[PDB]
Amino acid sequence: XTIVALKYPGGVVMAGDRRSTQGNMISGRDVRKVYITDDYTATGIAGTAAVAVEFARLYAVELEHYEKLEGVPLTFAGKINRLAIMVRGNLAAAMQGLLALPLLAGYDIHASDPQSAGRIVSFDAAGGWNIEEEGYQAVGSGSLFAKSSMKKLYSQVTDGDSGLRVAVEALYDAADDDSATGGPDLVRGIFPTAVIIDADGAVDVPESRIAELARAIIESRS
Amino acid sequence: XTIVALKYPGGVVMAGDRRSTQGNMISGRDVRKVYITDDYTATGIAGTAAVAVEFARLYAVELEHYEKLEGVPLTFAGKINRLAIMVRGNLAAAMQGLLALPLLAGYDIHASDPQSAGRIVSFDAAGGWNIEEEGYQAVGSGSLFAKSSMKKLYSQVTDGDSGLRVAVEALYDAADDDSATGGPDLVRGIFPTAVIIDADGAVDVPESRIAELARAIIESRS
Amino acid sequence: XTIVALKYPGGVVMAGDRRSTQGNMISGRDVRKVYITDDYTATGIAGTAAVAVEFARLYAVELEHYEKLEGVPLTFAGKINRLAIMVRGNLAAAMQGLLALPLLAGYDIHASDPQSAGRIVSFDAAGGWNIEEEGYQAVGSGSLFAKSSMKKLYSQVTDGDSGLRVAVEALYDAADDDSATGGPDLVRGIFPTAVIIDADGAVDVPESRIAELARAIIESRS
Amino acid sequence: XTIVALKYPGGVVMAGDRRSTQGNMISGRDVRKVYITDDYTATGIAGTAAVAVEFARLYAVELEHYEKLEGVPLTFAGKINRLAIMVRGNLAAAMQGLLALPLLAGYDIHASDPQSAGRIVSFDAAGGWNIEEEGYQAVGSGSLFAKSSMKKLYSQVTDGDSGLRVAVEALYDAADDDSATGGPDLVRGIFPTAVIIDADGAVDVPESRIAELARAIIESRS
Amino acid sequence: XTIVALKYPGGVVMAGDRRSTQGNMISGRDVRKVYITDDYTATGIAGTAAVAVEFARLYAVELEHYEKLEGVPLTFAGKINRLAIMVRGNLAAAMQGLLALPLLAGYDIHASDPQSAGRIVSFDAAGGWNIEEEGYQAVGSGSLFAKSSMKKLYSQVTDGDSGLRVAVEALYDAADDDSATGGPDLVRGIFPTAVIIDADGAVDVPESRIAELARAIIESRS
Amino acid sequence: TTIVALKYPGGVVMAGDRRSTQGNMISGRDVRKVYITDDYTATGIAGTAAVAVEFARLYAVELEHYEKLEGVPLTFAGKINRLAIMVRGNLAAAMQGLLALPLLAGYDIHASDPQSAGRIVSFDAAGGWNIEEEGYQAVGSGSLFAKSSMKKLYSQVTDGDSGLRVAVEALYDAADDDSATGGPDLVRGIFPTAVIIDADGAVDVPESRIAELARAIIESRSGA
Amino acid sequence: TTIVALKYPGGVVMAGDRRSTQGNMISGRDVRKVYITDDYTATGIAGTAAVAVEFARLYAVELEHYEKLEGVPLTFAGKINRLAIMVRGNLAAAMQGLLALPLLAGYDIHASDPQSAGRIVSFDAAGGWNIEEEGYQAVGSGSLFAKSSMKKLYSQVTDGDSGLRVAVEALYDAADDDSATGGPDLVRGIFPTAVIIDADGAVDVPESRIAELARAIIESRS
Amino acid sequence: XTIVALKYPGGVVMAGDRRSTQGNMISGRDVRKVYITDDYTATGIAGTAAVAVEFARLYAVELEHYEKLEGVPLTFAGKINRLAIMVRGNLAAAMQGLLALPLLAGYDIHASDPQSAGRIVSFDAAGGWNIEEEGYQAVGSGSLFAKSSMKKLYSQVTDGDSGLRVAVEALYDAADDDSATGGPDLVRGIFPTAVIIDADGAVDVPESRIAELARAIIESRS
Amino acid sequence: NEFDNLRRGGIQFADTRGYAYDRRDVTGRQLANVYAQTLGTIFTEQAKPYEVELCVAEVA
Amino acid sequence: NEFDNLRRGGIQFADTRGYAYDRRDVTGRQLANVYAQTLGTIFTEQAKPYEVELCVAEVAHYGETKRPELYRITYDGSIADEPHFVVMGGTTEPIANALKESYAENASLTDALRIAVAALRAGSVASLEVAVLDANRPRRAFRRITGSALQALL
């Protein structure tokens, strides 16, 4: 599985593949790994459909819990801390094999510069966080391939459209070199999911828009 | 990786995928696993890119060696015994992790009935052989998926064309469910390899034909 | 053992074998692994013959407990969550060898489209769930054979009768290729059990109507 | 040690051997393994002289305990559940080597058909139960031999007397092929014990009647 | 070490050796292993000296405690159950090397027949108890030898004097074949200890009477 | 990972590299390991790079919590004792592989001589502390290279500027001999981070300054 | 360590880094890992430390040895086979930690098409070889990064110059993401080594040309 | 590292070296290991600094705490008991490798003879104490060398000046034969620390007096 | 709020008893009894007695 | 301090139930029930009863059709189901009567706000706290009507 995230001028985009494996066997082809967690954030977890939907569900509950109790949303630093705590609280279960590494994408509505208000935060085994200053990041079994792809393609990111294209291509490159990451299935019509976040909030990118970009990448390579 | 073999009236067909993997990484895309070993036989080994050529190369030398020394080819029974000895001689190395399981397809030119002269022989870890009386067989990580696909499609096998199609489809179905087996790559133009053997000998099925049959299974499922 | 479940237009059907094995030895021929858990759901458990009744009995108690307390049934999403919690609470005991993976079939009375209101949910070791979009699913030692059978036969499913047939055929195929799954015993008169769920509720399919389908599959393959 | 149980028209019969071993050494020759637990049930445990009585004694107390507190006896299903709980509560101790597998025989006074009201229930390591539809069952080190004997002799069961004979013969066969099961000792006058349960309740079969049957099995095979 | 116990008409007799060993070395010659625990019972313990010596003491306290609290002594069955619980409560410590196996001898004052009111009960590692109908029993490293001796000589037991003589001979035989059991030391004047229990209660057999018997057994074999 | 600290006349300077690795692979290029923990202290943590921000955050809270409650800052020795207990309370988790060794730099307001008021304290696995009396110290996988560099360079430290420059050079030298320590990246514009503490308190040295320093070292050593 | 090799029209180019490491410590900055082995070949070894100079030396002796004895060079396939035998003869030492995986670049003077006569062959642990049809390959700790860089840059290869440029950039990318691979040291004036092979033979690329390419790549990324 | 202590007429002197090692690497040159714990005692710890640093501070707090609470200081025996208790408490942590063995030097103000009122107490792993009658003692990696030095030099101890000389010479001898013990460093001016205790209390010996002694020892051996 | 508390506790009791023994083993007499013991305890020990009156009914 | 305590406990309750079952398993009836039980226990167990009066309201889910539910929970734990309006605090009767008359079932937002403000006035601008449970929002129905929007509304 591979999850990518990148900053574009005015926002951030996060995308993830749809595969699930039980060793060598493909156990799922429709898995959703990227979820909108509140109006300005999205989390992607490299793993099973449930440990991705249950982690995102709990974090979403935690964030909205604070908002209702206090009247205002948590600060982005606050959102990071809460996620870090959740991951750290799963360290005892991560020594068995139940590892879940999240990637957080968000837009800081309180940032000075709206152009660079997109945020990408990655977490390690211990529950340690790092706010990425390089522009892009990826987690999962195909992350090295996706990061190396974005390294060559990032200069082409100028807006939301080009950013989403680079994200989909990175995920394509991940699936091309990693069997645990699923590429776009033109036969069944299953494509990577994506979330785009700007000053107007977090929006699920429609399947049709990704399908158009997938076909363009395929047609560009043959 | 997956290798399939099936008997059709008047012959036998053997086909294999092109994928290679290290862990989840795809390390090979063009791998040839099926080789013509003599005028009437072919071997398919599901392992490394070279564990297929090197095993086949030695076996081909052994068969030809006998023919030049005695002036006649070995009996089909003799060909099986020689391959069984080669596999048994690699038992000490198969305990380390260097397991090589060959699948042999052939046409017994000395058989009574030319219709059922096709032969499929499988080998186990110990160097034990079994002549297949079920009409089809498969080896490798995607073998169970391929055998279960052929189980439902074998009745459509009445000749060489329908036999090859079923084989390609079985390989497709294996790739569909096993990430270690590679499906037909329409972008790069890489397709499974196949060998067809009848009374006229062993021949390498041209890419053009496996390609046409791959696009038809695709176009049909979509 | 093998349990299968598939969606048909207007409902869902779940069926399971009757075998129990202690190693090679057959310890049970009459085992029942599928139970109606409430008016619109049924669970089949793979792991132990004794466990399936106990897991189903507790889950049935949990579901009716809520219905009595709050006066309305849990939503289908709620039913999933409670089952996921039960499975997660058995993670400590699953490390010893007492693994029990359930498969849930149900009809969502609150769904928009009554034709596609059938639901199939599978669970992994960790207690993670996945609502199936592909139409069918299976769990147990013969699940791969059953899923591969259903892959070729699913297009023939159109009503409750054809669905139950494919389900029984999938189970037949599972028992044909897996010694731990029991095929229909015509001598003792023991057949797989099944449950069918539609807008009128969950009903146990009569033994006699499964026997009719088993006789049919057997004569169709002779 | 071996314990057998079988259904006859109008009731059920349970019988067990008298041996006890410490490795190869015969440590007991007079061991009672089958005990009447209430008016309509009897339990036989595969093991020692005491780790059988202790299980029976506790179970007996529990059933009576309920009858006095509630004024009515537990249902047969309730009696099963209580025994299942007792066995499950000994899972931690069964990992050491203190494994106790009980076999329950009873007559359901609340059953529709008095002819088939006899009940046989077996338990596995985990505390899982299975109500037997097959007519007979056995537990212990000679259980396979006894079940194979009953398979051939069960058709001769038409009443209480014939059912008791088959039980004693099954135990004879168990002792003939398993050194841990004790055959009838004509020298010391020690014979297997048995309990017969019908609509009139559970009654210990007199030693003299079992001796008569043991004499007759021995003369029939000489 | 070895402890023996046998029934005679009108009572029971228990006797034990005086040896103690630390590996090969002889650590004690005066050890008493048989203790009167109440008016009608006596226990002999074989195993580690530390748990055994303490063991008689704790048991004596439990029996007496019940008697003062309730006004009447415990039934013989009750006395057994209490000893069984004490032994079971020492199972965790028995896995280390602190194994203590007791042998209980008693006279049931509430028995129908005063001639056969003697009782011998043995315990296994698990805390399981057995009552000996054979009339003799032994525990310890020399038990097999003592039991075999008793089997040959039990016929000669007609009263308390002959019963005691057999008990001493069995212990003589145990010491003759087992180096961990001490024979009668005529040089130091140390002999096995013994307790005899009849309708008049439990009384320590005096040293001079045992010496007279030991000398006669020695004269008889020389 | 390498973190250096040195005393200069009137204060102390602490600097750390930005690299993170997973095995051979470079997992991060912008990790910050040096943090101001109160008005007069800074902590640098080596290893478990993601966690460096977290350890500093808890220590900072403890110091401030005391200061607000009691109305006065803890003594420097008190500050040391608190940090030693935090480290000691993490011995169980360090046996697994989650090891975090801190380096503490501070200025003692209460010290008699202002010029020698700067402090450097290092901690070992067990939670044991040591107040450095030799003028410099370093922790992390490149610490030996950094300490050996400073041993030849320290004599030229006479003020805050030259102290910062010896620290950057020490870090540079460490990156030179240790692959787990990242040197200044002129291509991406990422440089080591630093904190300087004197009588006026703890201040983050601007990226601008560490940058001009690194370029003066790197560009000249190279053809530039 | 990272070694790269790529085909350009009319030849092949191979390049390698200069780093050596002991755990995290850098133990070498001037390691030559790419050596001309005969007039039309070059081997690069991602092997413990300097073994490469011993290895390349032995292979060169072997190639030259055949040449003097037979008066003609070995065929490229023959060259490959000899190298495969050398690697296979080192499997016993590779289990300890002394792994040495070579990459072979060559120009087949006997090939039909001079434009595609460049050859790249990689070897696995077992001594298995694979000819690269994809155009490029890399071995060592930074191979994935280098291959992912070349995937995006390979289309820019049109001649000897542009081929050397892409090889140097691939090695730059490898060093950028892998600490065990050394980037170009402008301070000490140490740069990656390279060999270029065409119809005129194998030639060492001068340090100065690699230096200009390195500075141009550095300048291009700032 | 090494710590020495010796009785001189009217007092006790304790001295320790300044080295700290991490394997072979010198990690500290100015470590102080001897601390005044109350008006009449001093402790020197060898082993783990983290354990060592803590022990002195805590012990001092303990002695003073008692004094303030009760108005009088603890007896010398009590002081020993408290130290011994602290050491035992640390035993669980000593099995890991956190071993800290203290050496206690004191002056018993309540002793009969003021000339022999000096006290030296050593502790072992278990927390066991011993008061030296021989006049000197040492702990640490160089203790044997130091004790053997003092064995030959103790006859020269006539007062506090000569006892401090012998103490510093013993430490010199320890460093000469043990690389883990630091000798006096003339270049850095770092010398062993010492504490001298008499009827006037415990006092830190000034660095300058120790330095004069070291030079004398050095001049005496050149 | 008081009788709903009691309603919930009864459902809690009934479901646990049925699970522990058998469904056929849960009766109105048993439930009435659990309520009497519970009401009795509240009346006796709680600050305020429950202002409730309960009916438990059972059919065949 | 007393009703904010209750507000927090309700959110605590709601979020826990929704996570243990599912979002569509939390209702106004459930929350009113739990407030009744809490206020009832406080009235009886605690030294001083809570000087509060609570209203729990529920609207239908998006695209679903159900009439709004309004619950009044009083200091003693008494719970009443109101079908049209709830008035709490201060002098309730003049406000309750001004509403019972100037009532408009299915009224507009602008109309219902005016009908309400006036009643509040009978009992006794930015001197108001206004909010709605907007049945038309996808999930979170609660929306505050503040400042300029509130001003625009008037």
C-alpha dihedral sign at B161, B165, B168, B171: negative
What tokens appear for J105 in the block?
Answer: 């079932």
CB of J123 closer than 8 Å to CB of J91:
yes
CB nearest D74 (choices: I25, I27, I30): I25
What tokens appear for D157 in the block?
Answer: 């069961």
What tokens appear for J70 in the block?
Answer: 């309004």
Q: How far apart, in whole angstroms, are the C-alpha atoms of residue B120 and residue B6?
A: 7
Among I13, I16, I22, the strongest candidate for a mutation testing the D interface, having the largest count of D CBs within 10 A, is I22
Q: Where are the beta strands (DSSP E) in chain F?
A: 2-8, 11-16, 20-22, 25-28, 34-38, 41-46, 101-107, 118-123, 129-131, 136-140, 193-198, 201-204
Q: How far apart, in whole angstroms, are the C-alpha atoms of residue F76 and residue F64?
A: 13
Q: How far apart, in whole angstroms, are the C-alpha atoms of residue D206 and residue D15?
A: 12
**Resolution in units of Å:** 2.6
What tokens appear for F54 in the block?
Answer: 């977290």
**H220: three-class secondary structure by DSSP:** helix
CB of B129 closer than 8 Å to CB of B84:
yes
Which residues of chain A lie closer than 8 angstroms to B176, CB-CB? 26
Calculate the alpha carbon distances from E101 to B104, D28, E61, E83, E126 in Å.
66, 17, 18, 11, 10
Q: Cβ–Cβ of J40/I4 closer than 8 Å?
A: no
Q: How far apart, in whole angstroms, are the C-alpha atoms of residue F195 and residue F104?
A: 11
Calculate the alpha carbon distances from B7 to B10, B97, B105, B167, D79 in Å.
8, 31, 9, 10, 59
Least Cα distance to F154 among F171, F138, F135 occurs for: F135
What order do you get walking across the sheet with C11-16 strand by strand? Answer: C136-140, C2-8, C11-16, C193-198, C201-204
Question: Considering all CA atoms of chain B, what is the largest pairwise distance in Å, rounded to the nearest integer?
Answer: 55
What are the backbone angles phi and psi of residue B216, rounded to the nearest 5°?
A: -75, -35
Length of chain I: 60
Alpha-carbon torsion angle E211, E216, E218, E222, nearest 10: 160
Calculate the alpha carbon distances from C49 to A115, A212, D88 in Å.
61, 50, 15
Least Cα distance to G177 among G141, G213, G209 occurs for: G141
Least Cα distance to C217 among B152, B157, B135, B132 occurs for: B152
Chain C residues bordering chain A (beta-carbon distance below 8 Å): 84, 95, 124, 126-130, 133-134, 144
Going from N- to C-terminal start, the domains of chain F cover 1-224
Eight-class DSSP state of A149: H
Tell me which amino acid residue B82 is: R
Q: Cβ–Cβ of C130/A29 closer than 8 Å?
A: no
Q: How far apart, in whole angstroms, are the C-alpha atoms of residue F25 and residue A23?
A: 25
Q: Which helix (H) or strand (E) holds J36?
A: helix J28-45
Domain of residue J73: give its range: 1-154
Q: Cβ–Cβ of I22/D66 closer than 8 Å?
A: no
CB of H40 closer than 8 Å to CB of H146:
no
**Residues in chain I that come right before a backbone break, where C and next N are over 2.5 Å apart:** none
CB of G185 closer than 8 Å to CB of F223:
no
Chain I residues bordering chain D (beta-carbon distance below 8 Å): 20-22, 24-25, 27, 30
Calculate the alpha carbon distances from E18 to E21, E32, E187, E191 in Å.
10, 6, 14, 7
The single residue listed with the structure tokens 């004694």 is D57
Q: Where are the beta strands (DSSP E) in D102-156?
A: 102-107, 118-123, 129-131, 136-140
Contacts (Cβ under 8 Å, ≥6 apart) of B83: B43, B59, B102, B104, B121, B123, B129
Calculate the alpha carbon distances from F180 to F145, F168, F187, F190, G22 in Å.
12, 16, 19, 16, 12
Which burial class, exposed, middle or buried, applies to I18 when counting CB atoms under 10 A from its CB (0-12, 13-18, 19+)?
middle
Whether chain J lies against chain G with 3 or more Cβ pairs closer than 8 A is: no
Gap between the terminal Cα atoms of chain D:
24
Regarding beta strands C118-123 and B193-198, do their DSSP bridges make them parallel or antiparallel, or are they unpaired? Answer: unpaired
Q: How far apart, in whole angstroms, are the C-alpha atoms of residue B181 and residue B176?
A: 8
Least Cα distance to F118 among F104, F129, F130 occurs for: F104
Eight-class DSSP state of A137: E
Tell me which amino acid residue H186 is: L
Regarding beta strands D129-131 and D102-107, do their DSSP bridges make them parallel or antiparallel, or are they unpaired? Answer: unpaired
* DSSP β-bridge partners for residue A176: none
Contacts (Cβ under 8 Å, ≥6 apart) of B155: none
Least Cα distance to J136 among J40, J55, J25, J60 occurs for: J60
* DSSP β-bridge partners for residue F107: F118
Least Cα distance to G46 among G178, G139, G162 occurs for: G139
Calculate the alpha carbon distances from I43 to B192, F182, H44 in Å.
83, 74, 69
Q: How far is G126 from chain B (nearest CA, A)?
A: 8
Q: How far apart, in whole angstroms, are the C-alpha atoms of residue J86 and residue J133?
A: 15
Among J33, J42, J44, the strongest candidate for a mutation testing the I interface, having the largest count of I CBs within 10 A, is J44
What tokens appear for H42 in the block?
Answer: 């001093």
The single residue listed with the structure tokens 């109006």 is A39
CB nearest A24 (choices: B176, B180, B186): B180
Q: What is the 3-state secondary structure (H, E, C) of chain G?
A: CEEEEEEECCEEEEEECCCEEECCEEEECCCCCEEEEECCEEEEEEECCCHHHHHHHHHHHHHHHHHHHHCCCCCHHHHHHHHHHHHHCCHHHHCCCCCEEEEEEEECCCCCCHHHCEEEEEECCCCCEEECCCCEEEEECCHHHHHHHHHHHHHHCCCHHHHHHHHHHHHHHHHHHECCCCCCECCCCECCEEEEEECCEEEECCHHHHHHHHHHHHHHCC
C-alpha dihedral sign at B56, B58, B59, B63: positive
Out of G1, G41, G43, G181, the active site residue is G1
Q: How far apart, in whole angstroms, are the C-alpha atoms of residue G17 and residue G175?
A: 8
Question: What superfamily would CATH give domain F1-224?
Answer: Aminohydrolase, N-terminal nucleophile (Ntn) domain (3.60.20.10)
What tokens appear for H77 in the block?
Answer: 């025996």
**J16: three-class secondary structure by DSSP:** helix
CB of F41 closer than 8 Å to CB of F64:
no
Eight-class DSSP state of C135: S
Calculate the alpha carbon distances from J31 to E94, J13, J42 in Å.
57, 8, 16
Exposure string of E176-197, with b = 16+ CB inside 10 Å and e = fewer, is: eebebbbbbeeeeebbbbbbbb
Q: How far apart, in whole angstroms, are the C-alpha atoms of residue C202 and residue G208?
A: 81
Is the domain covering H2-222 a CATH 3.60.20.10 domain? yes
Residue G21 is among the residues annotated as catalytic for this protein = no
Whether chain I lies against chain C with 3 or more Cβ pairs closer than 8 A is: yes
**H156: three-class secondary structure by DSSP:** helix
What are the backbone angles phi and psi of residue H113, rounded to the nearest 5°?
A: -95, 110
CB of C137 closer than 8 Å to CB of C103:
yes
Q: How far is C60 from chain I (nearest CA, A)?
A: 10
What is the CATH architecture assignment of G1-222?
4-Layer Sandwich (3.60)
Contact status of D81 with chain I (Cβ, < 8 Å): yes
Three-point CA angle H47, H52, H55, nearest 5°:
140
Q: Cβ–Cβ of C78/J25 closer than 8 Å?
A: yes
Q: Which helix (H) or strand (E) holds A202?
A: strand A201-204
Which residues of chain G lie closer than 8 angstroms to B55, CB-CB? none
Task: Give the number of other CB atoms < 10 A from CB of residue B89.
Answer: 10
Which burial class, exposed, middle or buried, applies to B204 when counting CB atoms under 10 A from its CB (0-12, 13-18, 19+)?
middle
Residue-wise DSSP of chain E? -EEEEEEETTEEEEEE---EEETTEEEESS---EEEEETTEEEEEEE-HHHHHHHHHHHHHHHHHHHHHHSSPPPHHHHHHHHHHHHHTTHHHHTTT--EEEEEEEE-TT-S-GGG-EEEEEE-TTS-EEE-SSSEEEEETTHHHHHHHHHHHGGG--SHHHHHHHHHHHHHHHHHH-TTS---BTTTTB--EEEEEETTEEEEPPHHHHHHHHHHHHHHH-
Which burial class, exposed, middle or buried, applies to E221 when counting CB atoms under 10 A from its CB (0-12, 13-18, 19+)?
exposed
- Total domain count, chain J: 1
